[model samples]
Target: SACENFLLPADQDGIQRQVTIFRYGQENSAPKAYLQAGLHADEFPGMLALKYLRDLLDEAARRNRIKGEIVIIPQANPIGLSQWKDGFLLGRFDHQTGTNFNRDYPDLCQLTVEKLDGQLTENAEHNIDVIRKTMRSALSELKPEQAVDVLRHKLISESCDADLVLDLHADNQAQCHMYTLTPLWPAMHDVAAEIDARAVLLAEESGGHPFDEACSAPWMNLSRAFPDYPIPLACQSATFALGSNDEVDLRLAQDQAEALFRILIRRGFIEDVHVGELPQLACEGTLLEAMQQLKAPCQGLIVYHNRLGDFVRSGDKVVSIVDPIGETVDILAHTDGVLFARHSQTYAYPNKVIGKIAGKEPLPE
Candidate 1:
């Protein structure tokens, strides 16, 4: 039972960024799971869940029930949290560069491939250890320019060597859901079931270099790069969207945290009592591309014709753009799918995503 806080260099405004890490079990322990919340600083559900989890972890640690290393970072982005202007907490993007807080993490596979040219061996376990060490070294060697970049590097460094990485986050006006690599879906199903996720979006590459992908994607890429050597997907990482941003229920947070603890137990991070059978799958795992992001055609008041979780046929009305002066325009579903998330805001600007449809088939790029 130990905790440490590391402070990064102060920004131009002289505001320092700090990250607190709580550790359970021994150093360099196997089956490590790194959990961090509030990366998108405006999101509070995950942060609250982490607080509940922290209390559980403290008790477990005192009882000496922890079997493997578990690291928890309750607040992951100090820079984003400080971004308050115009009476709004703008924590999703970097105020200086306008880049999303979760995007643009270092590609460890790309960075370490050349470095491991003659280092790989037939032994998968040995190779995994070698790769993880090299990846950590590469990340440590990075020279970040801005304060946000430093934070990204620090977060990656802490998570790179873990067997499991959970980047906790939240969506707007949505049920609990997850975004993970397609290959890891079957292995990650228990986690989904435990959390009662309404949807699981899977993709090998989801465009943005999100934190979870930064940890797990490299192993997939490495496996492809060196077919002769055994490169196991050593890291299992996913973005766990707790729920809607505005709906921060403590009961929900505690339940979610309990589910997470059961996951850790299943993964052997905690030596705990038996957990009950996982709940039935709440929803199906679908391709990330199947989730069609519906953007507003023009600025207007968004009127929803369909509710979240409603299955709709092609050409069904999803929403209506009500213009004060212009005629009311309706947005239609282009494919058969379920409405899983809607923009929490009533007013919409041109080209803004107002709704998301999770279709069965992948949408055309």
Candidate 2:
């Protein structure tokens, strides 16, 4: 249970990135699991949860409860974490290259589409194999340039081989919730119920195909390739979205960590835990919500009339943009749902996204 500590080289800052791997049972275990936190650098809850899990695993190992190898990267974005300007922390984006750290992954879709442009006649199974091969090749070609990209690539490269990957994140000032794809809905529900998640947001309709989507999309795509392929491929991975960063909800963070450990144990990544023998796990209803980007209609000081986690009806006054002279310029919110994320900054420039909300129900099929 002695986890190995490795430092990824950054530029001349003498500040190497830290990645700690807590291994258990055997090496190269089947169904290896990876858990990462602080990808955005500001999501502190997952970091706390990961620290708590680290302690739990250490205790479990002391008590001889480990089942298999579990790699935990508690901090995946040291560069972002280190970025601070005049008492303001710019942890969400890479300052050096002006890249949204999470959105800059090597696009496997492009690689697959390019290689298979005229090969649609090939069998689906063969195409899937080719696709996976292409993905591995594409990922291998990534050479980290800046400090942030170096940290991002190191984390992804370390996790690309995992059978299951859990990236922990929190929305700004939101309630306790999570995000998953349609294919992994079953597993999502199982874990949600286990963790007492308030909402399980389905992210299939969102096109950015973000971090969790990027990891799970390829597997789901491959499964869909062969309609006859009985194997459930997408269930191989998952990601957890803990709602919001502005709230100091310690209980929710601990609960999230506990539930993650249970899920990992159930998957044979850890042992000695009572993997319950229930015929069917309890699952709450899943909302397949699309992510809508809400932009600032005008430049002004923003006064949020509604806090995150509050349910709003369509056309409800969610926020007010006002001029310094006390004149209201714009009011927003076009849908009814829970406000899962919002910007912490009070000032909004024109066309900047203020926040987002995941729907309570799936947009009709």
Candidate 3:
């Protein structure tokens, strides 16, 4: 019931976008958690999941069940939402700048360190507050040139200081999975289990400055940059891929929302809520680099031999690309791992990733 809407500045077309944030409990509260959905506007499962979560949060707010502050942004990317062309939804990348909506968030660690140079202390709590304030200030000073940039700034500004951040998403025709930093896996393993995540991909730097990395990487970078300052990894953030984009099941959404609520209770964000025993982890965590993406060597019609969640050995045939006029090429697994995700389309383009294999050891880049 407690909600507020923040309108971002108008774009070139003079169209304004609004982000609605539902708040529960007091401000400046400890153990704050931020949850956002639809960063990739095409991913609809997380959007529906958060819709159910909104109803749950409203009831909780009425009963005062929330302890620490919890912020929920049901739809985080309106810029991408409006980018429909030729009767198809193109929401993964910004139509104006041709950039991914999730990439290129400001690197707060570098900014914070530059601003707080020679001012840090041995006190961990004091350093956290100071760095958090600096991060917020750095984000505020950013001047975005495009509408997508404005959306990124708004998202980072809202989540920069939270204790926990969750960016909800979904893969194309894939099982439920999650992407998180390696250091946060210990703290987040239970959450993965609760959500029944099939694969957990851990990476310190997966190249692009994704929303989850933007929230959690700063603490790690700061700690390493100033070893004497005792900068604790204050923020634990993860991207939840809630399964295939096409399957927005209400029952699944309700279950996922309930799992999130239970996790908040477990984290001491709410009182009088009992968290029962956690289920076993669906799969072991894999390094992001070890997950080999099998791309199509030539453009053809792809037929997958192995389905999602199937474990295949190295050299096993995973897919077959038939060149209508040429030979049928067999796509083999380069390593032994689970086929966690696959491209939704049957048609493949040359060098386009068609499937992902989560291996135990790192594969050649």
Candidate 4:
């Protein structure tokens, strides 16, 4: 297992850190993939899954079956990893700036579109080469003032050239699900089925320029920018939420890791693999905007009437919250959908989002 270390600019005096990536196979290999976990710091299952996948890849390397490059970052954030307070982990945001670690990544589409002027050709592969080179050049030219910005730049640059990018994460309480750009769906759903994703939420733009978009959006953006040149959806990326964050069940992680390894073989990135067919899709893809973020009416003891993956119609009493004053208030679903996710907490605050529902029909603005 070969590894590389990158020193990051320190955000404060007397403190420093480095990002480590485990590499396999040679550069310029077909179907290169970039996988990372714990970008939110507190999310643990994906890191565990990557660890198991690392060992599987190691075995493949010894067998001489590794036919393409694979980059894995088992723990993607050390700055947030060390942020702990009062016996609790505070790792999702920068302590100094309160910025969500996953959001506000450098939009590579906007950056590379300018540099790629006149650099593209009629050949799709040649254009891909030019675009990737320009994207990497653009990333190196960035002057990130903060440590988080630097980290984001480093991560985006690493995955920008990849054919597949997976930014692994987990929700509070939910079935395994996936979030990805709309156009990549059905084609990108193989990995989803491999992992048995219960719901796949597709969005044209998920609002924030998250790390996944930083990898795949450039292809979408560039195609629109240069409509004449044939641009394939070369990069497929997804934010794979691996169910609940309650514990580190290694067996489940092992299953996921093996699933991903087989995925490599299925994509022809590994040779002579005897992988079986992927499982059927657990559910069809739905619009991200259609997914309702169910909020409680008032703060108190929380109770749910239905479990995750349950279907309910409009006005269904899905939740009840007993206020601090011992008065119970009901929360009802406003749309017909499957309850894909909900809170792990029994107690919640007033008007706070406690769950999400995957609906087919788009919600009103």
Best by TM-score: 1
Q: Judged by lDDT relative to the true structure, which candidate is superior, 1 or 4?
A: 1
lDDT of 4 by residue, 56-116 (tens): 9988899988888999998899888888899877778998678999999888779888888
List the candidates ranked by lDDT, beginning with the highest: 1, 3, 4, 2
Candidate 2: C-alpha lDDT: 0.66
lDDT of 3 by residue, 1-365 (tens): 46877777787788888878788888878788999999888888888888888788778877878888899887898888888899878889987789998899989987888898977998999999999999988887888867778779888998989998989998888988999989997789888988888889999988779899999999999999999888988999999999887778889999989888877888888777788898899799889988989989998999999988999999999999898988888899989988999988888889989989888899878
Count clashing residue pairs in model 2: 2
Superposed model 2: Cα runs more than 4 Å off: 12-15, 108-138, 205-209, 224-231, 246-250, 275-293, 330-332, 360-365
As a TM-score, model 4 comes out at: 0.96
Clashes of each: 0, 2, 0, 0
What TM-score would each prediction reach against the true structure?
A: 0.98, 0.80, 0.97, 0.96
Model 1: runs farther than 4 Å from truth?
none
Give the alpha carbon lDDT tens digit for every residue of 227-298 in model 1.
999999999998988888767898998998898899998889877568878789878899988888888898
Cα error, candidate 1, residue 130 (Å): 0.7
Scored by lDDT, the top model is 1
Off by over 4 Å in 3: none
- Please report how far candidate 2 places residue 19 from its true position, in Å: 3.2
Question: Candidate 3 — what's its lDDT?
Answer: 0.87
